Amino acid sequence: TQRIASHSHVKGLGLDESGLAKQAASGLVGQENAREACGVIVELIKSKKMAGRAVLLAGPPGTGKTALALAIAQELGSKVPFCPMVGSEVYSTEIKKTEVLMENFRRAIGLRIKETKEVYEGEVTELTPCETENPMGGYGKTISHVIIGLKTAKGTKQLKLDPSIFESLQKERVEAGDVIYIEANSGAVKRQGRCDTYATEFDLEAEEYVPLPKGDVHKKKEIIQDVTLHDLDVANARPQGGQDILSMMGQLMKPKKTEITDKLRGEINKVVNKYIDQGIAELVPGVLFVDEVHMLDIECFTYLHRALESSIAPIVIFASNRGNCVIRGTEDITSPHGIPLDLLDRVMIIRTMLYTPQEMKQIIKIRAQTEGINISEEALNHLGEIGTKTTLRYSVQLLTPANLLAKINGKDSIEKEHVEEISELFYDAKSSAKILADQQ
Amino acid sequence: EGEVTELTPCETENKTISHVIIGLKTAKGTKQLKLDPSIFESLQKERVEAGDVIYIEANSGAVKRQGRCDTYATEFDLEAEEYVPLPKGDVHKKKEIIQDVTLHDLDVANARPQGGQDILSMMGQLMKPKKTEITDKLRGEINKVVNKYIDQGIAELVPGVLFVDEVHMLDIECFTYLHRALESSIAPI
Amino acid sequence: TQRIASHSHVKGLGLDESGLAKQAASGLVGQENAREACGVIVELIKSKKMAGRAVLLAGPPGTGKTALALAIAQELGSKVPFCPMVGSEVYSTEIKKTEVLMENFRRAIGLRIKETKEVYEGEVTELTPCETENPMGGYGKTISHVIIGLKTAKGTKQLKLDPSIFESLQKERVEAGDVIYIEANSGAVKRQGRCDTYATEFDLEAEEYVPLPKGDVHKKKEIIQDVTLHDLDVANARPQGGQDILSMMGQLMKPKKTEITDKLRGEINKVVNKYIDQGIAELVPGVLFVDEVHMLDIECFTYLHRALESSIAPIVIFASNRGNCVIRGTEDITSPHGIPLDLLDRVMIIRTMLYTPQEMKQIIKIRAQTEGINISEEALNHLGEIGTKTTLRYSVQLLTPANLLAKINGKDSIEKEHVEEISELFYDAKSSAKILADQ
Amino acid sequence: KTRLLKERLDQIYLVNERRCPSELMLTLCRCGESLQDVIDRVAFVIPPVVAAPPSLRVPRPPPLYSHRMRILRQGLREHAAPYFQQLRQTTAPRLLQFPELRLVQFD
Amino acid sequence: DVTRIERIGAHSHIRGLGLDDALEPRQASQGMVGQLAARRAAGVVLEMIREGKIAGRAVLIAGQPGTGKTAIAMGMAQALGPDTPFTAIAGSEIFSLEMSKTEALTQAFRRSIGVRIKEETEIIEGEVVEIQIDRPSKVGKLTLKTTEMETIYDLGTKMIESLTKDKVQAGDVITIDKATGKISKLGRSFTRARDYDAMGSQTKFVQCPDGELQKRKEVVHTVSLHEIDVINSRTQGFLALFSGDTGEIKSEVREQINAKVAEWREEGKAEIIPGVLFIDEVHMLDIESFSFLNRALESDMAPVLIMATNRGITRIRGTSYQSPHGIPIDLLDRLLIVSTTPYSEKDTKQILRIRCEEEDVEMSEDAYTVLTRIGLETSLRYAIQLITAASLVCRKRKGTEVQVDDIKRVYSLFLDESRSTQYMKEYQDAFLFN
Amino acid sequence: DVTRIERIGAHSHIRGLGLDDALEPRQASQGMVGQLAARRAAGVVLEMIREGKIAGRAVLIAGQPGTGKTAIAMGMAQALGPDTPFTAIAGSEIFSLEMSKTEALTQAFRRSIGVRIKEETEIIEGEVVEIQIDRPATGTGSKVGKLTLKTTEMETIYDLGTKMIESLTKDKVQAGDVITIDKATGKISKLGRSFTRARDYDAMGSQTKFVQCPDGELQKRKEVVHTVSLHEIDVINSRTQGFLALFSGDTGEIKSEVREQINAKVAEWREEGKAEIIPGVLFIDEVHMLDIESFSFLNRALESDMAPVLIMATNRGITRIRGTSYQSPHGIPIDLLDRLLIVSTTPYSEKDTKQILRIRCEEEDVEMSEDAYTVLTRIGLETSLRYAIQLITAASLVCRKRKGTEVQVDDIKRVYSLFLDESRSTQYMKEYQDAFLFN
């Protein structure tokens, strides 16, 4: 089976068609107001009209604010990009902090390129030149066409090509029985190999007797590939051409990250707009999720002031649990959520609440179902009491050890005795901290 | 400098090019020359062929193909070449000039050498260039050769002025280093 | 003859056959308890059974901690590794501190490889260019037989080569008259030089001639070589040699230290264990000496916990003179010796005591004998008085300038007036401190 | 006896780890054009000095050192032979300016 | 549909400064409203930029948060136009690992100065009527025409090479550079033959060129001083324009480039187009950066500097001292300060009206009144942000206008700083590291 | 008496956790003594690791120094055995100059997850008999030929594709030499040769270059399985020859997209059945000096489905979090501690201390009197366990220098006099605090 993670039970926000929140749906329970707000945010993202609008998820630890951001990802599907990052990831040794943020801003903007081409392929059979003697003058022998006959699986057809193909034709070194590839706009020939009909208990060739292709001799191919703007920046910044010595020199010296200039960003935006206008590309603006945003420096926040005001920027989701805490990079400046007030004015704040014991019990039952665990009612009630006493996440963590303990004892379900034993083998942070006074 | 009349190598085992023979033409005359294989490779550099006009500097071995002679301008109605006149001076010229440089230029030019012809120097130049912490040995040797130039009458020293505005931004390590630097016999005002 | 260093008089620990310390022997005087403990550690190192056992030498400055460590090094002999180290050396610009520590740990572990070298060496008499015989069919254009004949000062012999080795020999333009080196099992070939009998063959030269060898042409003997990481870990980090482009232009890149992976060290350990089992290698564990260990960071100590807990680790000797001082990198927390208590629980502590005036006088006499200095009894007593008043090291340092003044004044021995003048010329730390306190 | 095994990674592992993008962003000079057109238009700076590498001179070089240097330079030249012209074209410095031809008319 | 890369940002509604011909500001124009004195001052600064005589003048925009400092900056940027440079950064961007702070500021300064290089070229442009190549050394012949005239060219060898590599054929319309023989294909005037199979791209057609086949024309190219520096910094240094590996360009290169640009200016080749450098949130700069700016502004190649900050008496970074705006008074003496005032009730209402137009949102007058009171009570940016949310809420109920109830709904859903701080103080034990 | 690389370390006596099939700890088995609750919890965690279904689980081991946290972790590693990753580091190892802390933790995470990948080898192998290749005849006929291979019970003649002949000439193909090729690629390789002139010789100076003879039909289809970690796949994919960085450790900050596409590829192989994932363990000893940034990274890193089990060890009580001015339990933020399950180690009793000393004596091959055991047990209770363990080897060495056979109380007293612990050394330092420096 697939491995079970902390947020694997989350499948969506569980909202009505009207956008109101069900009490329990899609793996989430409670946080109805926050989930309704997240519903509004997914509608905002799907509208694709807005750039740089930002959201802060704020509340105590364990209130599922990380889960709501992942629920937003599930509602949007795999088409829309969703870039998760931690605030501590900006501290790179290779590039400056503001470059890391801009790389992740661009990673969240997607692009579907839908280029089309039409081709001809199959086994060559003719290599037949036409002839008309003279080019209306003093003459030897003139061809005026080249007849090329292809057959692959469905049938056979003859093509009277331009005579100019002949140079490229022996440049590719084709002969009868080979199989080729020719593109319609350019007429550029490419040799793929020769058919498997001259194979099957011959073998011994590096070219491979490539099999006789399936389908019609004439094909129209529609290729769709998904790509981010950061991928375009990285690809266009480098000299990838192997024919230059400095490219293969790049192999030995380390290919570190580099601080991409705004000129390249502008040119890539220009060509992307040209592709969009001409109809070859479709833009898919996405989401950047910055959890543990309090770890960022004052420089990072002050750069985000400009970055969020851009017309190119994606929707950004921040998450924090700090109270009135000192801003990193400052000496003594306190602010709510460990974030400056100037950035806090630029975000819409979604509050998350502490859970009731019934909600804790319901979440514990959901996690037990997700982990493939059968738990009795009294065991579930005792585990909910433990979660009320210590923490939801701690009580959730005790399910799998208790199930293992029951399996060791031959039983198929968790009773109260197993959770009681596990709660004394393992300790929570508060109980251990009280013990630290005893053991200094 | 002159129009390349002919260009023929001479090679043999000690296999390798011993030298290249080249002829050059100008309005005042013509001459046959034998040159180093480094200059021969610096001629294949510019895709030089017979009839082309070139400029060679023998001190550095630098080569410039100015273009093709104007004699061949009428040979085609349309051709991608760029045409230049024939040179009017002598084929071989000996010229004297005066060059303005600093001691730092001499230090940097020898610290990160750039004018070589060996393969190893060419590989080293592929590295990304960065400033390096130049040693006192190199500066002493540069002082030695500068003094030799001055004693030979080749060169004249022009000591100048350094202006450090807002020295308060320097730190205590920088200030303490200036004690030794300002006490030197080479240092400027 | 070597120059005279600070600890050049130290030749050993000066212990009797029972392990008890003599009052004065092998350049050391006093510190009998610490010398006996150091002897116990010497027996520990020679046993080659333990790993990661750590020792701390503690005491005031000038009480001989470094001297006892170097005495351990002298007692072990040169065939055991002894890697000296200072705590300040971990702060590199190329690699992290823990890498520096692990590199020195591996440097203190020695490997002793035994191998036999066999070689044919002598004057080339002929190269016997025999023909291809029947062609092989596949290519035809190749060589088969190619005997080479060799001559020496007392022998003559011929041998048959693989044709590829003959191609390599011909690649070096070898002919008759050349003295050749031929390794008996590998493909190595070298012309040592043209024979010395060809003095009139050419009027000039660019390569010098070589005489004939002596003994049988098939020279052969056993050899021994000692190694550490020097050619095992760092050798496999960046591949020296090679023939592709990337290796060749790696040969002219800047050498830079890199943080070697634990996996490579594990594979190195595996292959070394295999060759120890095969019997062609002997493992020689050694000693790492980290003087001024208080200069290490808290991260370094916390890494040293795990490093000393390893089974492959060497014996480690620390030294410190600090009191209850702030641990570096912690900014508030004090601890004995400037070392955390957690690491200090992992080390056996040896205490060095302050010296009496008699021991100071005896050390001064030994230093004078070591430096080649004659000194009178009155001057020696006055210098010992100075040493008790100021410091042993200062009084020891005053010896050579006094001898220079005596030689300038035409005297072959130090007298009281010379040392008195030197004391009036050169000031100690406390006297200068008194001057700075006054002004 | 012959030595066997102990190649750690094996190249077949590297084959198994197989690992399975372009645009007109190079138009940095505006108005289209290849970027070499604009580079030629504004590349004029020359070094003030330029100098050859220092030479390590000894009265009698050892044989092993000279042999190593001969092998290394021969290998580098032979293996850079396919790349050689483009290589030394990319690396070579700019040591001559010359007046621009339009100044003849302008003067 | 057709979502281009530029979507509705924070300052998308701004398209100018809304000034009269006499620089007198209008109450609402070009997306700007209010801030009459600051907009007038920005217009004067824009005229200073346009004339370009004076070098290295510095301006600071100061005021409380939300007062339109950045809006005035983008208004200047839009009114100035694309032909003149306008380099915009945050103060945090100079703290690079590739280069020093002074190097970064030098690059930013030189990005904002344009060099308008101008040169003559000769081209041959015509429809290809016929081409012949007798490949066996190669020889050939070409024919080109316009609507006016036709000419046959006997080709040289290298021209034949270029024609073959570009695969030029008859019916094409091409342009041939007379200086170096480079060919560029503009299109086709005649279709390819329909007898040929598989090479059947439809394409589009282009008219025949007019007039003489051979013409001499002037061409203008614009590059920044930083581009010239990076190109001349090293061999193959042009790649650093995109990759950013411009580490610490040597000063001698810059001196040579300045001298060459000056002599180009006197020799009629080039014109200097001095632009603007904008540093938003300049209080992030260190004392060293300001000290460098003091001398960098005294060069004749210096651009106009514009800065924006909100701080009062505030610590200078890298020091323990305090000064106005978090800037030392060494630099504040060198610059003119522009003050932005808070907005009134009517100005807030007009900003919200303009923002609704940009976002295509219709709201009732009661909704506008309520949102204006919300914006006065909490902040302008919060009220602006509520517009899109209220529109989405209206849309999901299949409404046509945003009503007061939708605004109150999103006001309940999404919290401002004051309410969130109050509720955080209620859960002060639950929140971490107070 | 052969000495290998692995010698007697601190945790060498530990062979496992010493549990019954019900995860119930025995009082003394597999080298471990006491810590019954912690060992039972470790057994539960070990079973959770072996199951492998749940990802990103985190465990902390806490207690006073010397209470067996590292011993419990080593027992888990030993019981888990090979074929499952157990990546052990110290918390200070992440502070690299070449990569960020988050990158180092990412590498440590992905190094702890193994992948087995299976490949089907469609090779032809055999010993060559005869080759015949034509001369130049225009076109591809210039290099056509035939090639004969033979094995123990078969031989056959194969035509050639005209491109591999240069590889044979480059490798110096020889009659009777052994080769093998891969179908549909060629990819010709050279295994060995026979040297048919000699028979039935090996490892002496006759037929030494023989390797092997073929033993079966040439169509040797076989299945081969490649065990590799995820981090190795990232490093191999990061560069053209990034596998060298796997030895040198010269990896940069690897791109995120490379890791994501590798995760996708591994998931594709896993659903295809071509590969299978072995999630392992990451053990970080002394996490109390990880930065706040490191812990914040770990918070999200433990939420991935491709995360290992994280074991952690810490001594301290309420101490400062590094990178902050805030006190917290264990030097860890409480936002991470709620993701952890804490097992607590208790101090040992007299009986457990004596049993540990007996086990260490057995490991070190030391015979002691019962009076010596009692004396060393009181020493260990009063000073520390590690000091008492250290004294065993020293007492044995003193006994052997005495030509003794079993260490008495006198040897223990002698060694106790020679080597001090923290308390006595600190007392003697405080008595001479005027001499020690920088208090």
UniProtKB/Swiss-Prot annotation, chain A:
Pfam entry (one): TIP49_C
Tissue localization of expression: Ubiquitously expressed with high expression in heart, skeletal muscle and testis.
Subcellular location field: Nucleus matrix; Nucleus, Nucleoplasm; Cytoplasm; Membrane
A Gene Ontology cellular-component term: nucleosome
Claim: Nucleotide-binding is one of the keywords in the record: yes
SMART domains: AAA (SM00382)
InterPro entries noted in UniProt: AAA+_ATPase (IPR003593), P-loop_NTPase (IPR027417), RuvB-like (IPR027238), RuvB-like_C (IPR041048), RuvBL1/2_DNA/RNA_bd_dom (IPR042487), TIP49_P-loop (IPR010339)
Residues that hold ATP according to the record: 59-66
Annotated crosslink Glycyl lysine isopeptide (Lys-Gly) (interchain with G-Cter in SUMO2) location: 214, 434
Highest taxon above the source species: Eukaryota
EC code: 3.6.4.12
Outcome of substituting residue 291 to N: Abolishes ATPase activity; inhibition of MYC- and CTNNB1-mediated transformation
GO molecular function annotation: ADP binding; ATP binding; ATP hydrolysis activity; ATPase binding; cadherin binding; DNA helicase activity; TBP-class protein binding; TFIID-class transcription factor complex binding
Subunit description: Forms homohexameric rings. Can form a dodecamer with RUVBL2 made of two stacked hexameric rings; however, even though RUVBL1 and RUVBL2 are present in equimolar ratio, the oligomeric status of each hexamer is not known. Oligomerization may regulate binding to nucleic acids and conversely, binding to nucleic acids may affect the dodecameric assembly. Interaction of the complex with DHX34 results in conformational changes of the N-terminus of the RUVBL2 subunits, resulting in loss of nucleotide binding ability and ATP hydrolysis of the complex. (Microbial infection) Interacts with Mumps L polymerase; this interaction regulates the viral transcription.
Further information: High level of autoantibodies against RUVBL1 are detected in sera of patients with autoimmune diseases such as polymyositis/dermatomyosistis and autoimmune hepatitis.
Entry's free-text remark on domains: Binding to MYC is dependent on a Myc domain essential for oncogenic activity.
Family recorded in the similarity comment: Belongs to the RuvB family.
Protein name: RuvB-like 1
Curated annotation (Swiss-Prot), chain D:
Tissue expression per record: Ubiquitously expressed.
Signal peptide: none
Subcellular location(s) per record: Nucleus
Subunit structure: Component of the NuA4 histone acetyltransferase complex which contains the catalytic subunit KAT5/TIP60 and the subunits EP400, TRRAP/PAF400, BRD8/SMAP, EPC1, DMAP1/DNMAP1, RUVBL1/TIP49, RUVBL2, ING3, actin, ACTL6A/BAF53A, MORF4L1/MRG15, MORF4L2/MRGX, MRGBP, YEATS4/GAS41, VPS72/YL1 and MEAF6. May also participate in the formation of NuA4 related complexes which lack the KAT5/TIP60 catalytic subunit, but which include the SWI/SNF related protein SRCAP. The NuA4 complex interacts with MYC and the adenovirus E1A protein. EP400 interacts with TRRAP, RUVBL1 and RUVBL2.
Function: Component of the NuA4 histone acetyltransferase complex which is involved in transcriptional activation of select genes principally by acetylation of nucleosomal histones H4 and H2A. This modification may both alter nucleosome - DNA interactions and promote interaction of the modified histones with other proteins which positively regulate transcription. May be required for transcriptional activation of E2F1 and MYC target genes during cellular proliferation.
Family that this chain belongs to: Belongs to the SNF2/RAD54 helicase family. SWR1 subfamily.
Name of the protein: E1A-binding protein p400
Organism (species): Homo sapiens (Human)
Stretch of the intact protein here: 1742 to 1896 of 3159
UniProtKB/Swiss-Prot annotation, chain E:
Example of a GO MF term: DNA helicase activity
Residues at which ATP binds: 63-70
Cross-link (Glycyl lysine isopeptide (Lys-Gly) (interchain with G-Cter in SUMO2)): 425
Entry's EC annotation: 3.6.4.12
Gene3D superfamilies per the UniProt record, alphabetical: 1.10.8.60, P-loop containing nucleotide triphosphate hydrolases, RuvB-like helicase, domain II
UniProt tissue specificity: Ubiquitously expressed. Highly expressed in testis and thymus.
CC annotations in GO: centrosome; ciliary basal body; cytoplasm; cytosol; dynein axonemal particle; euchromatin; extracellular exosome; Ino80 complex
Nuclease among keywords: no
Gene Ontology annotations of biological process type: box C/D snoRNP assembly; cellular response to estradiol stimulus; cellular response to UV; chromatin remodeling; DNA recombination; DNA repair; establishment of protein localization to chromatin; negative regulation of canonical Wnt signaling pathway
The keyword DNA damage appears for this protein: yes
Reactions catalysed, as given in the entry: ATP + H2O = ADP + phosphate + H(+)
Phosphoserine found at: 418
Domain of life: Eukaryota
Localization per Swiss-Prot or TrEMBL: Nucleus matrix; Nucleus, Nucleoplasm; Cytoplasm; Membrane
InterPro entries attached to this UniProt entry: AAA+_ATPase, P-loop_NTPase, RuvB-like, RuvB-like_C, RuvBL1/2_DNA/RNA_bd_dom, TIP49_P-loop
The entry's keywords: Acetylation, Activator, ATP-binding, Chromatin regulator, Cytoplasm, DNA damage, DNA recombination, DNA repair, Growth regulation, Helicase, Hydrolase, Isopeptide bond, Membrane, Nucleotide-binding, Nucleus, Phosphoprotein, Transcription, Transcription regulation, Ubl conjugation
Subunit field text: Forms homohexameric rings. Can form a dodecamer with RUVBL1 made of two stacked hexameric rings; however, even though RUVBL1 and RUVBL2 are present in equimolar ratio, the oligomeric status of each hexamer is not known. Oligomerization may regulate binding to nucleic acids and conversely, binding to nucleic acids may affect the dodecameric assembly. Interaction of the complex with DHX34 results in conformational changes of the N-terminus of the RUVBL2 subunits, resulting in loss of nucleotide binding ability and ATP hydrolysis of the complex.
Record remark: domains: The C-terminal domain is required for association with ATF2.
Protein name: RuvB-like 2
